[PDB]
Design an enzyme around this catalytic site. Sequence first.
Site, PDB file in Angstrom:
ATOM      1  CB  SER A 115      34.366  15.844  54.732  1.00  0.00           C
ATOM      2  OG  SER A 115      33.112  15.716  54.091  1.00  0.00           O
TER       3      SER A 115
ATOM      4  CG  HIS B  34      24.616  31.836  50.152  1.00  0.00           C
ATOM      5  ND1 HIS B  34      24.631  30.458  50.218  1.00  0.00           N
ATOM      6  CD2 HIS B  34      25.913  32.227  50.193  1.00  0.00           C
ATOM      7  CE1 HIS B  34      25.881  30.037  50.294  1.00  0.00           C
ATOM      8  NE2 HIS B  34      26.677  31.090  50.281  1.00  0.00           N
TER       9      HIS B  34
ATOM     10  CD  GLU C 179      30.335  35.759  50.193  1.00  0.00           C
ATOM     11  OE1 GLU C 179      31.352  36.477  50.282  1.00  0.00           O
ATOM     12  OE2 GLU C 179      30.341  34.533  50.432  1.00  0.00           O
TER      13      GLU C 179
ATOM     14  CD  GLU D 248      28.786  34.221  54.003  1.00  0.00           C
ATOM     15  OE1 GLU D 248      27.889  34.831  53.386  1.00  0.00           O
ATOM     16  OE2 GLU D 248      29.678  33.557  53.430  1.00  0.00           O
TER      17      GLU D 248
ATOM     18  CG  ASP E 206      32.546  35.494  47.015  1.00  0.00           C
ATOM     19  OD1 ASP E 206      32.996  34.936  45.994  1.00  0.00           O
ATOM     20  OD2 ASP E 206      32.470  34.897  48.106  1.00  0.00           O
TER      21      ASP E 206
ATOM     22  CD  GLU F  65      36.441  35.968  47.564  1.00  0.00           C
ATOM     23  OE1 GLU F  65      35.999  36.844  48.330  1.00  0.00           O
ATOM     24  OE2 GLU F  65      37.198  35.069  47.932  1.00  0.00           O
TER      25      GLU F  65
ATOM     26  CG  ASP G 190      37.296  31.152  48.249  1.00  0.00           C
ATOM     27  OD1 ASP G 190      38.100  30.650  49.066  1.00  0.00           O
ATOM     28  OD2 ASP G 190      36.060  31.008  48.337  1.00  0.00           O
TER      29      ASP G 190
ATOM     30  CE  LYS H  26      36.934  30.668  52.500  1.00  0.00           C
ATOM     31  NZ  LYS H  26      36.248  30.126  51.283  1.00  0.00           N
TER      32      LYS H  26
ATOM     33  CG  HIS I 293      33.929  34.493  57.359  1.00  0.00           C
ATOM     34  ND1 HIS I 293      32.796  33.849  56.921  1.00  0.00           N
ATOM     35  CD2 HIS I 293      33.990  35.621  56.628  1.00  0.00           C
ATOM     36  CE1 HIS I 293      32.120  34.649  56.117  1.00  0.00           C
ATOM     37  NE2 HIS I 293      32.819  35.748  55.938  1.00  0.00           N
TER      38      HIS I 293
ATOM     39  CE  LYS J 172      34.406  36.942  51.551  1.00  0.00           C
ATOM     40  NZ  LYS J 172      34.746  35.513  51.309  1.00  0.00           N
TER      41      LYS J 172
END
Lengths: 130, 434, 434, 434, 104
Positions: free
Chosen positions: B42, B155, B164, B205, B242, B291, B318, B343, B371, B394
């Site tokens: 947002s 993460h 990632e 994920e 990533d 990435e 990205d 995306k 995603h 992906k």
Amino acid sequence: MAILTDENYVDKAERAISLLEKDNKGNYLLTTSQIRKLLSLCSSLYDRSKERKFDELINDVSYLRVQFVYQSGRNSVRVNRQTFFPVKDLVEKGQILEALKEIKDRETLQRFCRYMEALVAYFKFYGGKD
Amino acid sequence: MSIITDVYAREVLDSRGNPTLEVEVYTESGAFGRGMVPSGASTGEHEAVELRDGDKARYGGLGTQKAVDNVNNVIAEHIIGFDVRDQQGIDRAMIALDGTPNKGKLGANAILGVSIAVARAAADYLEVPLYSYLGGFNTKVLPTPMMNIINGGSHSDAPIAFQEFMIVPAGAPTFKEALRWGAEIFHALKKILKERGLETAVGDEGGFAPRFNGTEDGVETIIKAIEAAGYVPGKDVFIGLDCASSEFYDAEHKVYGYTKFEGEGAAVRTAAEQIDYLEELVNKYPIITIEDGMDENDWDGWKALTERLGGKVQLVGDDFFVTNTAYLEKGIAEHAANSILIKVNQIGTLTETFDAIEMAKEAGYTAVVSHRSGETEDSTIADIAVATNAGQIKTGSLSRTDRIAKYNQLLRIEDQLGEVAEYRGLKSFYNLKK
Amino acid sequence: MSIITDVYAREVLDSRGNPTLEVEVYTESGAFGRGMVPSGASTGEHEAVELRDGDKARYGGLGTQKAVDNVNNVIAEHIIGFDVRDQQGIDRAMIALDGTPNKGKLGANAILGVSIAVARAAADYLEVPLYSYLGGFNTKVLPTPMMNIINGGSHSDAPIAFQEFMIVPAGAPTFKEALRWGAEIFHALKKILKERGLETAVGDEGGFAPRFNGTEDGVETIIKAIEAAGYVPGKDVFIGLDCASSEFYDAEHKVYGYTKFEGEGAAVRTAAEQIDYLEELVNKYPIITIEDGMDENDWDGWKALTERLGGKVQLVGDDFFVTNTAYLEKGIAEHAANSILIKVNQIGTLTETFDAIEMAKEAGYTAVVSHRSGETEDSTIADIAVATNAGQIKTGSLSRTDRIAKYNQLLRIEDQLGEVAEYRGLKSFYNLKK
Amino acid sequence: MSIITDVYAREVLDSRGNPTLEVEVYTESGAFGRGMVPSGASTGEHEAVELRDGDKARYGGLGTQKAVDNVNNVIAEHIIGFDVRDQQGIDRAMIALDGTPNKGKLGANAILGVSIAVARAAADYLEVPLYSYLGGFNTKVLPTPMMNIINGGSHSDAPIAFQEFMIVPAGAPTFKEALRWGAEIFHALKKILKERGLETAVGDEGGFAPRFNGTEDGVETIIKAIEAAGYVPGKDVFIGLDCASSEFYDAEHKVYGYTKFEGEGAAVRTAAEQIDYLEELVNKYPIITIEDGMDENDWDGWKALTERLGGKVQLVGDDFFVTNTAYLEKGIAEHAANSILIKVNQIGTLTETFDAIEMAKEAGYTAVVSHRSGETEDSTIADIAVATNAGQIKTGSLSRTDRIAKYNQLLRIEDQLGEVAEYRGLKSFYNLKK
Amino acid sequence: MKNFKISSTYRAARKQQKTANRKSFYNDEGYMISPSEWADGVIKGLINPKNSWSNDHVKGYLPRVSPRSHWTKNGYREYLGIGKSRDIPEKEPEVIEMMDLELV
Ligand SMILES: [Mg+2]
Ligand SMILES: [Mg+2]
Ligand SMILES: [Mg+2]
């Protein structure tokens, strides 16, 4: 006690109309076209109270009161999907009905008529529309 | 008969338990379409923003009742009456009805949900598969998947700065075999981590977040899992990264600080040092994709990285490109990256998604349909990848139905296409020389 | 017009990355149904067994190609020509075609996929909602969710013998409010576990498996999460247990050895001591459900547990009854348990699932429609729960689309029902007294 | 095409020659449904009241022109425009429009007629059988018929206080055989009454009302007829009683005075004496069900009767519960009776009828769908019994078609079900033990 | 409107003349506004989204409306606007006035 005295009805008009509702742009909501018949009746009754005594002026006062209570509930202005009832709020803030209740002789009747004249005068002073 | 007679949005949950919305479109003859919106952001200056309630009493301020009401009260009155096959007209009408560059008035989630529901309702009315309706008759290519298998960065608590790590089964003959290879490597890695004593629970994920010693340890364990499944690194399965290098980027000093994730003793690298580190990783390991190797604002660093590694390694933007046609055009003109991550909710509309994919393809770039962290049972991005013949997707790991649904849809598409179905694999990396 | 023209199965992936199958049914008029099978067990004494390939070079011996061929080359020829609305006739024909008590010849997964696909195609033909087709006109009760939030036993390495801890928001006015309460308690528990330095990555059902000190620690942390979300324990949200006592039950010593999961200092309790321990937990905490409190063969223990606690806490038999009608009838005759966990793939068909549900209902028991460890994007069990007016569902946590899909389907059902929708909460526990 | 376009009502006659109404419903595409209303009671504190004209010049005050006008003018304009498959919404709208707890404004007959007509029109639109529309796909159980054989009490001049005696062929293999056994026992008893000089004319429900020497003589003659037809009493055919103890209960002295129907020499029994007398009758004869064994206001006596005989004998509350949700809930909570007699016009709506059926089922009670004394050629209660899988029906004797129509409808339903149809018989008395 | 329905020919004309793709939007006072300010006003509640737009115009003097049908008790079709109605018409009001100089 009485709500209208000869020393304060003018100043009472100040507090009665300064708190009337307003559109978001700041202009007033009441217009002279809504209170035209009430002002005409008040002026005629004040005019007739000079020559004709009060024992036969009671019906004219009752007609003025029923006209006030009619025009307060009838008139409506709808702005921005919101309805408003300007004559009713004028009567509520100005205590017009309560002043009409205390009218018992010529002097208080003329004081009420002059109070109505003060209300319309000061409403015109702050940008009221005809 | 194809005239839209009903548009209705309702607030549902996503794969992380946070509210999102779904839209349903009904046409005159009874054709029905349902579009669910993955959860995005947002906030953001140069990307489409979603509309959240902000009421802390309900769902911690993440309710989507405002955007549901925007669909039910604003978008519904405008859209009802259009032909359901007028996807571009409906999308442009919604964009004009919003009036803002970021789609912040109606909400990008609202516009995207109506766009997906309208496309699916048109496909249902025409009695054709969704990829056939979106991309035409010449839909044959099954994307090569980049399956996330190990998570680090923000993460994971391990000393890894790369967000990632992924396996790319580009040596498979078909997509079905590629999915089988990915699942078997996933299970072999699970067995290796269980023997090692590391945590085996999955994240958003679907991949693991173990406590490795470093990036080299994670890549070596991935290669061990690949070999334990019976596949050859560098021939059958490759490795993608990533980095999400914007997270550990010190913008004030124009330096890449690995100390944020890899501990106090972690090396500090400038743009040239970061390029050298990525090149060393590419030489040591069968890495075919990197990435977000640089920050989203390091344009000179992106240009230098593409000049050094762009001829043999896919470089994906990205956060660099944010599914923005303007940013992608600027990157194409300045030779920054050779791939873009697509995306659909970052742009808000299927028409603009396909415009960005076409712009990327016309410049030799590859478009990778992606995603989000919070997904749904909607598997439209698989139909988007097949319809555009993008050749790469992906859509996460091999462990949650928010990810498995897209792979199942790709299996269904491959079964439908039959002999026509194509799996290029290494040939889907057309941005790379030879 | 409704005659089945095509039955076709394909092999897809489940939520755990393991293969399952899906069946598509097409009729003459173009009605379509798709049924995806959850992953069950290939072994069992008196439960329907699914068919696995056993090829160690493909998916580790978990392929479902044999059952796909069984649907395509055996079941399809038998079923094509039937009326799509003849669900009972098709299921009886498939049961007779299998010819074995445990459905081992064709595979329970194959038969269940065809049953679900046929039911959904019949609902599509009639243009009615699936729950309306399955349960008739008077389908209004939204099930009370029993949301798994913390894992123990063999699902975690913490010293907790019990396998699942769950929150039951039985004090909510609607299902939408109950789902919002469950999601907020889930996020509050996530925050609490992050503050304590415990692991947050979710398990198979979407819940956490943190490193707790014991059962009391986990229950107290759940109570703290409930209060942090802003809800009263024992009035708005209750606690349910899935002990899975068959995992730590010594058959020859006739004791419940807690040492298998709680260290060498744990309590090895007899059946009576286990009853007092469960009664202590019920008197200490707002526990409204206990599942598998005794071993699957401890019939005397189950009868004693029902005598002691069967009037205030719901006692569910999952492995005790294994959705078997014979076991359920014997348990009703012997006054063992007061609730049965309904798993559609452990019996084989929708007809026998509904027969088990109605037999449980007629005896005063509660039917709890339940998920499996490996789920799909298919959400037929939500329609089963609404159609039977069972009033209870056990479909996982608030964190993966394998579980969130059922909650989204229940939200859609509640929205469709509108003013006739009923959420009963504690009234759904009609097997309890006051 | 399913939108209710026309709702007509007219005044017809019932089986007693008294007026009732019927309602026809036409949808947009031409689907048609006709619902007839059985004659009920216009007075009652806690049962739905029907509207009579009260004009002593027409039909002795029993005309139904007022309720016909209510359907034609009031209900029709509210219902037209609804979807014919929205049975719950239509029923709720009619209940709200009545605005009375006992439906006294519009009349229960009017509302029930519109409900039945709407359900049948919806079944005709969907081209499905009425039981399939009402109960869904899992409708297979043919009810066990308790059919009237002998009358007494206020229906006969015999010195017998018990209102009804019934035969229950629960040992039959199928419903066809049960009907054949009932017809043959009926004819054998007719021959036995003829050879004894007693009158064989039938009453309102189709059964004989001869003069006997008491209850024992009546049960002996019924057992003799059962043996003369060739069947074993207590294994093939059982005896049911309907005492209607509210007719011969003196509330002031709290005694069941048999002197009202058995003469001056009859015995006066208290609650305990009445329970002892019912127990001796049960122990002497193959009696399987007793209906209204105690007074409708004797809750303590009902509880004592269920404590004593409720384990081995079915206890049906006809006036005890008056098909009222509140009375059924109070009886379930207080352990009073174990069965409820369901009359569809005692509430006036199919939705509430099915709600009462499921509420009774969930408590371990049986629901016995019952006819009225003034019935019609409508046979909807047969489809109600099959749709709910109630397993028991009570539709009079084997004479007047106002009874035979329901048996013919059940024969039709069994024929359509074919190999799927189930006749549980003694197994449909699940409220008992073993 | 229950006695009538939208005619099929008018619906087809509105369909592929594409009048629904050229909607006009109005505020609460009925003044034409762009779709952006219409959306703004509807969101803030200053415009009623129901009665605030128009579907352009269908060209060609087509009848917008056809009679709607229903079923009689015989099971036959019948127009909704025909039937017993009522019975009160008098004859006329003959007002004589045989003096008015009528112009030719
Ligand atoms: Mg990224
Ligand atoms: Mg369990
Ligand atoms: Mg009775």
